[PDB]
């Protein structure tokens, strides 16, 4: 079986930058290597076939090179919509294989998140559980520290985060943090605070509400 190793596993580059992605084959495969682009929630798209041939409808900024065991994908001048997971794939053997993939992030100017806190709805409280949601809207870089405080006591192991994929136009991320508590524990306390630490903020931002108010 032909193993394909891609390098790097991840990278971050600016608009206008030249990006190079490597694909190493465990055995010689001549030029029987294809490259694909996968956007989030979408099927992969063929970019290059026969190691260097540009597939129809693919912009010229994408090019392929190499033969034998060493192959390269080059993106000559990065565009914001170029953020994706890139894959190499071989047609040398009947047993088709793919590289592990390379996640490409588009570097952008720092943008502070807009923070919003949401108390649990009365409808949910009737079921015996309280979900408290914190939203971090349209920010860059991805690195963000979200801490929950209930009557100023730091919370641990009772929250989960979800992050959107980079916005194809503005290159930002949005993040949800959800605090889960039983109805009885929620009714026990008054102050519900979400504290956000991010590079775009001059100091950590706290969004809070008083239960009932």
């Amino acid at each position: 079986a032909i193993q394909l190793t891609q390098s790097p596993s991840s990278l971050s580059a600016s608009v206008g930058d030249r990006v190079t992605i490597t694909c190493r084959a465990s055995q010689g495969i001549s030029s029987a290597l294809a490259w694909y682009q996968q956007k989030p929630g979408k099927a992969p798209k063929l970019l290059i076939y026969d190691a260097s041939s540009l597939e129809s409808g693919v912009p010229s900024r994408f090019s392929g090179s190499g033969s034998g065991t060493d192959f390269t994908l080059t993106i000559s001048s990065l565009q914001p919509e170029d953020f994706a997971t890139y894959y190499c794939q071989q047609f040398n053997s009947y047993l088709i294989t793919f590289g592990q993939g390379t996640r490409l992030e588009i570097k952008r100017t720092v943008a502070a998140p807009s923070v919003f806190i949401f108390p649990p709805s009365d409808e949910q409280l009737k079921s015996g559980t309280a979900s408290v949601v914190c939203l971090l809207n349209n920010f860059y870089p991805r690195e963000a520290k979200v801490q929950w405080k209930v009557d100023n006591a730091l919370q641990s192991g009772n929250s989960q985060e979800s992050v959107t994929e980079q916005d194809s136009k503005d290159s930002t991320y949005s993040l949800s943090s959800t605090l889960t508590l039983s109805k009885a524990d929620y009714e026990k306390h008054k102050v519900y605070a979400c504290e956000v630490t991010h590079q775009g903020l001059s100091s950590p931002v706290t969004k809070s509400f008083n239960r009932g108010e």
């Binding site: 029987a32 996968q38 992969p44 026969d50 597939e55 047609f91 088709i96 949910q124 979800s162 889960t180």
Partner: protein, 229 residues
């Protein structure tokens, strides 16, 4: 218009069976070699099976003996019979066309290949967990919303299985400033997700906000109105 439409993906018990189908249109189906390629959430692409124009088949070791690819040219259809299913088989399954390209320069002439057409995919879930419909709760816009500023609102889609759920706003009319977060697996084994939207604070009183949640696996269609408390 070249397209591949997969169907048959669903929740199945471990050791169970499922048949996937793929409807091809916009090309001479019989003239192409076809594949099934899978991808588990957050993971890489994995080739499942190949079928030639003569019906000759190829499979990796992970799937050989349990999966059978077949084609029905008269019905422009590709199939995947999957037996003795396990947790490792849970993935989105894509129907894929193999393109053929002739490198004709001299000296020398040969054929090259590419996976040029892929379907949208069909989700397969191998688990003993029950199909469960979600509960839809509002994320009510804050009363402290800045005049002439931006207000955020949304819907919390809690405790459902299996994936996926779709969320639209105002029956697809509201798309701008919308963020539907990827589902997160809770400790209970049930999925939870929030869909948010930022709108002008002025519109809070006048404009009506409804999230249209659809969880097809459980036959749960819910329209939840989101208004200030």
């Amino acid at each position: 218009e070249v397209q591949l439409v997969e169907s048959g993906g669903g929740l199945v018990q471990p050791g169970g069976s499922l048949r996937l189908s793929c409807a091809a249109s916009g090309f001479t189906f019989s003239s192409y070699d076809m594949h099934w390629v899978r991808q588990a959430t957050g993971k890489g692409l994995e080739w499942v099976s190949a079928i030639g124009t003569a019906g000759d088949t190829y499979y990796p070791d992970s799937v050989k003996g349990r999966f059978t690819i077949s084609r029905e040219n008269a019905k422009n259809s590709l199939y995947l019979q999957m037996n003795s299913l396990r947790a490792g088989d849970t993935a989105v399954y894509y129907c894929v066309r193999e393109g053929t390209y002739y490198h004709d320069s001299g000296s020398d002439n040969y054929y090259s290949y590419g996976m040029d057409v892929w379907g949208q995919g069909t989700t397969v879930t191998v688990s003993s967990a029950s199909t469960k419909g979600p509960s839809v709760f509002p994320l009510a816009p804050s009363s402290k919303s800045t005049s002439g500023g931006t207000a955020a609102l949304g819907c919390l889609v809690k405790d459902y299985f299996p994936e996926p759920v779709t969320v639209s706003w105002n029956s697809g009319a509201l798309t701008s400033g919308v963020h539907t977060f990827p589902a997160v697996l809770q400790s209970s084994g049930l999925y939870s997700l929030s869909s948010v939207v930022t709108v002008p604070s002025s519109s809070l009183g006048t404009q009506t906000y409804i999230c249209n949640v659809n969880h097809k696996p459980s036959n749960t269609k819910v329209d939840k109105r989101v208004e200030p408390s």
